[PDB]
Amino acid sequence: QDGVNACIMPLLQIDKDSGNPKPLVNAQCTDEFYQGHSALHIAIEKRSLQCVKLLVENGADVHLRACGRFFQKHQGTCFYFGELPLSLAACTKQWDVVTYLLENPHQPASLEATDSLGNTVLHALVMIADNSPENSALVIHMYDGLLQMGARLCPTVQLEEISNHQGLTPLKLAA
Amino acid sequence: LAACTKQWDVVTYLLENPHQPASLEATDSLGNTVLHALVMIADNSPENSALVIHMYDGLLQMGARLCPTVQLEEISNHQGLTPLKLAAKEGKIEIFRHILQREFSGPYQPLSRKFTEWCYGPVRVSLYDLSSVDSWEKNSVLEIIAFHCKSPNRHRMVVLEPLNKLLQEKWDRLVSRFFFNFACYLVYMFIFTVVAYHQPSLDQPAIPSSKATFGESMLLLGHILILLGGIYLLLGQLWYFWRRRLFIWISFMDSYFEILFLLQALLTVLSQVLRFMETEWYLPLLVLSLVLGWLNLLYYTRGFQHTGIYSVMIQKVILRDLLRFLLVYLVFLFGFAVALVSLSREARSPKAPEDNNSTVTEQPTVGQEEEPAPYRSILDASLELFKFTIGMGELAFQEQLRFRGVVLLLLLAYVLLTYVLLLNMLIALMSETVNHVADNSWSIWKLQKAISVLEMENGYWWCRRKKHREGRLLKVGTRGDGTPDE
Amino acid sequence: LQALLTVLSQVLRFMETEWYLPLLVLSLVLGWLNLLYYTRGFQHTGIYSVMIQKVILRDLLRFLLVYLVFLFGFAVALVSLSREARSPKAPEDNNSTVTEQPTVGQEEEPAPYRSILDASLELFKFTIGMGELAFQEQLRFRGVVLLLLLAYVLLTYVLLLNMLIALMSETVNHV
Numbered sequence: 001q002d003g004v005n006a007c008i009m010p011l012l013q014i015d016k017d018s019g020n021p022k023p024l025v026n027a028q029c030t031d032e033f034y035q036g037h038s039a040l041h042i043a044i045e046k047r048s049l050q051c052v053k054l055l056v057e058n059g060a061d062v063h064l065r066a067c068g069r070f071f072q073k074h075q076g077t078c079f080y081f082g083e084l085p086l087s088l089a090a091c092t093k094q095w096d097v098v099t100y101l102l103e104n105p106h107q108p109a110s111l112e113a114t115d116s117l118g119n120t121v122l123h124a125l126v127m128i129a130d131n132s133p134e135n136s137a138l139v140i141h142m143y144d145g146l147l148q149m150g151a152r153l154c155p156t157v158q159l160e161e162i163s164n165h166q167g168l169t170p171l172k173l174a175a
Numbered sequence: 176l177a178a179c180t181k182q183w184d185v186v187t188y189l190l191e192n193p194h195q196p197a198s199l200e201a202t203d204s205l206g207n208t209v210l211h212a213l214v215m216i217a218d219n220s221p222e223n224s225a226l227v228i229h230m231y232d233g234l235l236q237m238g239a240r241l242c243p244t245v246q247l248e249e250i251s252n253h254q255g256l257t258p259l260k261l262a263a264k265e266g267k268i269e270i271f272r273h274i275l276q277r278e279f280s281g282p283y284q285p286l287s288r289k290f291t292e293w294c295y296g297p298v299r300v301s302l303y304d305l306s307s308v309d310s311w312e313k314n315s316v317l318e319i320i321a322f323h324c325k326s327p328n329r330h331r332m333v334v335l336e337p338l339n340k341l342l343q344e345k346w347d348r349l350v351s352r353f354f355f356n357f358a359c360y361l362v363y364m365f366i367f368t369v370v371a372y373h374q375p376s377l378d379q380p381a382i383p384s385s386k387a388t389f390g391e392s393m394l395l396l397g398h399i400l401i402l403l404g405g406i407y408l409l410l411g412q413l414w415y416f417w418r419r420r421l422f423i424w425i426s427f428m429d430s431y432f433e434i435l436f437l438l439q440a441l442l443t444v445l446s447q448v449l450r451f452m453e454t455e456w457y458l459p460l461l462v463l464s465l466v467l468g469w470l471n472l473l474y475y476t477r478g479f480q481h482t483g484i485y486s487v488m489i490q491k492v493i494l495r496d497l498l499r500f501l502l503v504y505l506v507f508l509f510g511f512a513v514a515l516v517s518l519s520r521e522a523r524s525p526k527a528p529e530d531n532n533s534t535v536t537e538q539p540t541v542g543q544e545e546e547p548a549p550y551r552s553i554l555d556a557s558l559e560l561f562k563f564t565i566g567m568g569e570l571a572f573q574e575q576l577r578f579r580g581v582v583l584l585l586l587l588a589y590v591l592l593t594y595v596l597l598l599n600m601l602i603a604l605m606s607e608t609v610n611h612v613a614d615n616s617w618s619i620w621k622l623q624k625a626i627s628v629l630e631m632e633n634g635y636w637w638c639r640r641k642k643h644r645e646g647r648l649l650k651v652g653t654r655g656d657g658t659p660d661e
Numbered sequence: 662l663q664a665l666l667t668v669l670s671q672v673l674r675f676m677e678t679e680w681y682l683p684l685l686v687l688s689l690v691l692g693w694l695n696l697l698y699y700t701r702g703f704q705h706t707g708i709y710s711v712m713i714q715k716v717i718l719r720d721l722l723r724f725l726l727v728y729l730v731f732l733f734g735f736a737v738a739l740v741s742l743s744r745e746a747r748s749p750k751a752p753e754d755n756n757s758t759v760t761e762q763p764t765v766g767q768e769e770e771p772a773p774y775r776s777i778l779d780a781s782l783e784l785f786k787f788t789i790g791m792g793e794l795a796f797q798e799q800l801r802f803r804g805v806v807l808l809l810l811l812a813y814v815l816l817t818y819v820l821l822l823n824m825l826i827a828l829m830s831e832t833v834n835h836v
Contacts, residue, residue, distance in 0.1 A: 368734075368737055368738075368741075371741055372737060372740065372741040372747075372775070373747070373750060373751055374741075374747075376745060376747055386752065388752040389751060389752040390750070390751035390752035390753075391751075391752075393751055393752075394751070455802075456802065459802065459803050459804070459805035459806055459809075460805065462738065462741075462742065462803070462805065462806050462809055463805050463806075463809050465738060466735075466738065466809045466812060466813055469734045469735075469738075470812070470813070470816070472730075472734075481723075482726075485723070485825075485828070488824065488828050489821065489824045489825075492823070492824050492827065493816070493820060493821060493824065496820060496823075497816070497820060500819065500820055501815070504815070504819075543804075544804075544805075555801065558801070558804070558807055559794060562793070562794050562807075565814060565818070567793040567794060568793060568794065602823050605823065605827070606827055606830075609827045609828070609830070609831065613831060
């Protein structure tokens, strides 16, 4: 509905007299399919900007795992998403909300962070990337900007040094 | 014809007339409505295709605006064919592709056929309808591509997404149980060959028991099982014949294994007849039934992946080059065969003024059981030279005694131009078929998979099925946002 | 399998019976067979060795399911026709206790024929094109078997022999 979520405020303040305000904004979905799922995830999925800005200014967390049965692979309909709004935010090229989900009035996004299977933004971007050269070029240049502001706003952390739960670097997993 | 000539000024005008709006649902002389006129006039020219699609779509747009509330595609012709059935009947994958590709972004939704629910940017989910497979009150869709088959192309139309994906998932969900059919048939043919192998060598047929034991009683069980399944093969082909009405009227041998099955079944019921007459000649007929069933094992290769692709490959090149190499083989080798029967063998009198053919096919109403083409006392030497003719035995002479040096260089001429110089020809141009049929063999592969599957459930005595809306996952990457207004 | 057959060779040689030798010839053909693993080294022959590794690794079982099955079927067709004393079977030991060697393997007279055991290993040795044209007490009423062998030799011997060579040449067109 034109990207403008207006109800950031009223259940946050009903959830302030009853006291669940970041719990209003960060209610991870307890569905099996939509699991671990916050509204910031939707705000990225709807590709809009009010939703991210007054969802984050509604207090939305950034490092939060969305270990959804909708959101991981089977070789069937459900495929891996990023499972955390920064991860899928990069996996959807959305530098406005990668940039925003860093630049938040509450939270810089942890670049070195991991996800549900251990599948970090390295494994999310790589694992979502296939031989589509549009997909390849976006998952390379978008990842490179994530290493550029990823080496500017939060430098001094070697992200590729991290291996997964299987002990694989993004060089090892991409390879 | 106004739509068939793109003339939207006079389609528009011939609607908007001060006297008469044009009836959209109307039919024509053969029953061939604007559906059948536009489709039937449309050929694979992409200018013709694009005009007969977009012009037809505008006819559905003002065709859905000035006169809405009439479902034109619902109409079938005099033959009972919808425009989906007719466009999917004259082999136009482009138009049928438009029909299931159809998607109207205007009020309101269910004109479309490719719906996208639980869809997503990376993750598209293209929902379909499978009215192609729900068309049971008329024929199914592969039925009407197959009838009439291949006005330009019959094998092409399966590769489109409901037909191909549906033909995949129905096999991998139901009809991968075809191994039970091949299992029962394989055990059947094993029973045939072990009864044939372990038969008694006694001259009198219908022996009571070789021995009252596990052996001969087991052989009686194999006999009763083997004709007890043969009657089921006869029941299957009679359902195929009364129900399917293939083969074609005056046409070629197509399809091959059907009439090969009819000749095996004919020869084995004649085997049953003369076995009921209790003479010894039931057995060569049994070996013929053996070689046609063990021959017919390759029909059961339609199942699984690299071997089904391989099975359609050998189905293609073998189905083409069967008679093509036979007209080389039988004719060159019959000619030069007769040339070798004249040279050389003494006692050259099977003919003329006697019974020349020794009453060829001497068996009344059983077939070619005689001494047909009786030779010049070289009958055994002539079946034997025909057995030399695939390269076995060598180099005899006789009372010619090497004055037939002309026959020597003569055989150097036939063996020259035929044995090497023509042997490389048909292999090479069937390799040109390989240069052309290889991608087409994929269309033949998905088709023959869909005939094993679709004919399998269509025959199965008396079957179940499952009919629910298709949906196809797509993981492709491209931009494009928006919504169908929720 | 070479190592297994040669340590069984060592076992039965330690039992000191004569049958150590056919196992030795099998070890020979699997090692001299295994010489082509040592072709991985140098340039035109290593390129060549990977070529034969590719087309041989693909078309091994693919030609075997044609070969063993067509030739087993028509083989049994020739064992039934023709040889007298057709009793290895049924109600006796049909298989003559096939693989009669306990824990050594297929050492027996397996698939005992219709007194054509030597004529059946011998027709299997004819089956790669050696010997010819015998008859027996059928005595040319098996003209049906004549044209029948013209049918199998027709569709299989020439008409199918060109198939797999051609589509492995399609593999050559791709690999």
